């Protein structure tokens, strides 16, 4: 019928897209990089650890000046940490006892936090009254919250739960632009350093990038077996790395859009939770569900020394903006601060 | 010993905040919570409404000097493989299936009866490996339809194998048997399989008895004899 001919067109178009993808490739990336020697064998000892919570910890993010740290707890508590002095700034009670994502505004004024309550709550930090007070209740979408990040003081981008992603405004609660191209629930999103593009990853073994101002599809990538549970960007806006629940790593580039090195290991069977890069784009710190923090090389596939000091499974990991510290949080009440 | 005025003020405030949060956790320790997986939009509104007297909705009461809270996760319309693991500290899960829901086309596939997908859902949540120490309570709610529905419509249509005669007791026991036989790990959990009613307010007392039983066996297997 008419549907069958449309499907034939779609599959044929995919055919020449794959033909172009195969034609663009010339040689494997690791083929040329073999000339350089490895950095070596690296490890770090625990530097300081904190004892502040009573249950599982899901969300934890750095500040804007690489000095302030905030984390989200299973109980309706929100805590503000200090790096060197290991003191604490504030402990903000929450309304919705269930949360899964916390964000920190770069201007040092706002903190975002949301959960399964299908709402987004924004609190002001410094006020002339003297206590932290909630500002408004930005909500409206039909799905649960998966990730929430900040662009600047007066726009915010939230990762939906059903199939969508949108850009919002703070002064007005109305949503400006809505994106509907995915085929399932979405997991997390990451913003580019230029603050003009962002890649978000759904659960249908695909991921794509978007336009902040224009607002429709540019490119689509596939080539995984199951959902992607982690996304991160290169320090320079040229490539990005994708994870998977099958414990395999995967790196994507933009213009060449070609197949790159697959950071896979034979003895690893169990999956991953979160991933982020460090400065210079040389090391790929990764979090696993086997109580392990494997370290790989950006330009070589060689295995390197690992960090393992948490009894119970780890969830998130992140590095500072100056390369002076890295912190990982696990499902136990403990939170660790490395070098 | 090098701390200045601001430093010791900060550490004193840190200690105060720590003691407040510790006391808050102590306050929030000793309350039981339950999960209400409806598995059908028929009786959940009922079962929540007689207990009282957007997204997740919370209902709270006090009964015989013991606090309760209920969480509803019925209408979310999303895949459960990603958010179910967030519920690990729940003591027990209340499961409900309507009685007269059989002999219906489900209005979607018009081939499978509601018993089918209800059994698959119950089996899937029973063999969820995150749940090992959790207990299950079954509540058959809309009983008043069954006695007159059975004589016009027997259970033979809904089952390939035989179901005996047509009397209330045997049918109740037989429904009970396919409800019971779904389990595989009988060594750790237990079932209560009540037949509730629309009056007499004995359901609250039954819930009290079931929850105290779970507490008792939990502590016993935790320490000493068990």
């Amino acid at each position, epitope marked *: 019928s008419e549907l069958d001919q449309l499907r034939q067109e779609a599959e044929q178009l995919k055919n020449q897209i794959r033909d172009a993808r195969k034609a663009c490739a010339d040689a494997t990336l690791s083929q040329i990089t073999n000339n350089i020697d490895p950095v070596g064998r690296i490890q770090m000892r625990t530097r300081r650890t904190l004892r502040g919570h009573l249950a599982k910890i899901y969300a934890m993010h750095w500040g804007t000046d690489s000095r*302030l740290l905030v984390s989200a707890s299973q109980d309706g508590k929100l805590i503000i940490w*200090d790096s060197y002095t290991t003191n604490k*700034v504030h402990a903000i009670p929450l309304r919705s006892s269930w949360v899964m994502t916390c964000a920190y505004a770069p201007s*040092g004024n706002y903190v975002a936090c949301g959960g399964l309550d299908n709402i987004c709550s924004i609190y002001n930090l*410094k006020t*002339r*009254e*003297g*206590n932290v007070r909630v500002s408004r209740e930005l909500a409206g979408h039909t799905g649960y919250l998966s990730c929430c990040r900040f662009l600047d003081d007066n726009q915010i981008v939230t990762s939906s739960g059903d199939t969508t992603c949108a850009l919002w405004d703070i002064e007005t609660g109305q949503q400006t632009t809505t994106f509907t191209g995915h085929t399932g629930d979405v997991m997390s999103l990451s913003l580019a350093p230029d603050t003009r593009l962002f890649v978000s990853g759904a659960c249908d073994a695909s991921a794509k990038l978007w336009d902040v101002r224009e607002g429709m599809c540019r490119q689509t990538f596939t080539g995984h077996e199951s959902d992607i549970n982690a996304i991160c960007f290169f320090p320079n806006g040229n490539a990005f790395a994708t994870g998977s629940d099958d414990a395999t790593c995967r790196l994507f580039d933009l213009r060449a859009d070609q197949e790159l090195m697959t950071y896979s290991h034979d003895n690893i069977i169990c999956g991953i939770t979160s991933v982020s890069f460090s400065k210079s784009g040389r090391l790929l710190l990764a979090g696993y569900d086997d109580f392990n923090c494997n370290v790989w090389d950006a330009l070589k596939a060689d295995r390197a020394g690992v960090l393992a000091g948490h009894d119970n499974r780890v969830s998130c990991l992140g590095v500072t903006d100056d390369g002076m510290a890295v912190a990982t949080g696990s499902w136990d009440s403990f939170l660790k601060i490395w070098n | 010993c*090098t701390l*200045s*005025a*601001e430093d*010791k*003020a*900060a550490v*004193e*405030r840190s200690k*105060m905040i720590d003691r407040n949060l510790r006391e808050d956790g102590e306050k929030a320790a000793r309350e039981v919570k339950l999960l209400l997986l409806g598995a059908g939009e028929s009786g959940k509104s009922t079962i929540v409404k007689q207990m009282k007297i957007t997204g997740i909705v919370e209902t709270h009461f006090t009964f015989k000097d013991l606090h309760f809270k209920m969480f509803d996760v019925g209408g979310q319309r999303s895949e459960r493989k990603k958010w179910i693991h967030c519920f690990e500290g729940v003591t027990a899960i209340i499961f409900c299936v309507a009685l007269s829901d059989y002999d219906l086309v489900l209005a979607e596939d018009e081939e499978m009866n509601r018993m089918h997908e209800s059994m698959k859902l119950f089996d899937s949540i029973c063999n969820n490996k995150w749940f090992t120490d959790t207990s299950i309570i079954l509540f058959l709610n809309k009983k008043d339809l069954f006695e007159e529905k059975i004589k016009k419509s027997p259970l033979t249509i809904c089952y390939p194998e035989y179901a005996g005669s047509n009397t209330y007791e045997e049918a109740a026991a037989y429904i009970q048997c396919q409800f019971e036989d779904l389990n595989k790990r009988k060594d750790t959990k237990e079932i209560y399989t009540h037949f509730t009613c629309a009056t007499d307010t004995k359901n609250v007392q039954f819930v009290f008895d079931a929850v105290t039983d779970v507490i008792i066996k939990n502590n016993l297997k935790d320490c000493g004899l068990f």
Partner: single-chain antibody
């Protein structure tokens, strides 16, 4: 708002007593801390005492070490302060203040209205030798301030506060640290301090810029105050 009032006053012969109370008005009295300062008729200021949050650490002055008493009550949002016996050098006004301490904290924001009381008829010293300058409006003139001891500390911060007091009103927080300027002030001013000898510079002399300025330090436990530098409008 943060409106604050003080109760108590009058005249009493030496050896008498009077009760001093202040009532908080909805500004998070739970987390903040109180203070008290001395102000002789036309002279400088002098620190009285301290109160911490949670009835913990408490500090007393030297001149009133065995003399003054103070207490705080969390409910009713009020502060308590008692006189036992009055000497001939206790005739001064009060100006209680508030402050909180954390990372980005700005101490000494609000200022009260004060109250007079008439009876009958080590420290890093601040000099502020400058007294009066004939500055005319429309230009930039600065005032210097240097100490007796080097306030720099290995943490990486300085401790000096600046204030401005219009005649007949309460002061206001100008800058709490060098290159750090408190809210409620335009961008005409700057820090301009280094070493152990600091100054403060203004861009243009505006009409409401006439008054007096004072120098603070927050290094040693007992705080003392600077001199008075009156600015004349001519």
């Amino acid at each position: 708002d943060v409106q604050l009032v003080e109760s108590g006053g009058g005249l009493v012969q030496p050896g008498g007593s009077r009760k001093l109370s202040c009532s908080a008005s909805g500004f998070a009295f739970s987390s903040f801390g109180m203070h008290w300062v001395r102000q002789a008729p036309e002279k400088g200021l002098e620190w009285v005492a301290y109160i911490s949050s949670g009835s913990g650490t408490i500090y007393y002055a030297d001149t009133v070490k065995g003399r003054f008493t103070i207490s705080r009550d969390d409910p009713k949002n009020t502060l308590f302060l008692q006189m036992t016996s009055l000497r001939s050098e206790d005739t001064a006004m009060y100006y209680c203040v508030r402050s909180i301490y954390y990372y980005g904290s700005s101490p000494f924001d609000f200022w009260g209205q004060g109250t007079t009381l008439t009876v009958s008829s080590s420290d890093i010293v601040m000099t502020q030798a400058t007294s009066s300058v004939p500055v005319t409006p429309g230009e930039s003139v600065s005032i210097s301030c240097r100490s007796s001891k080097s306030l720099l500390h290995s943490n990486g911060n300085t401790y000096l506060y600046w204030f401005l007091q219009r005649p007949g009103q309460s002061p206001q927080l100008l800058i709490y640290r060098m290159s750090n300027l408190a809210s409620g002030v335009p961008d005409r001013f700057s820090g301009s301090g280094s070493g152990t000898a600091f100054t403060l510079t203004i861009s243009r002399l505006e009409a409401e810029d006439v008054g007096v300025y004072y120098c603070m330090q927050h290094l040693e436990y007992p705080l003392t105050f600077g001199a008075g530098t009156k600015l004349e409008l001519k």
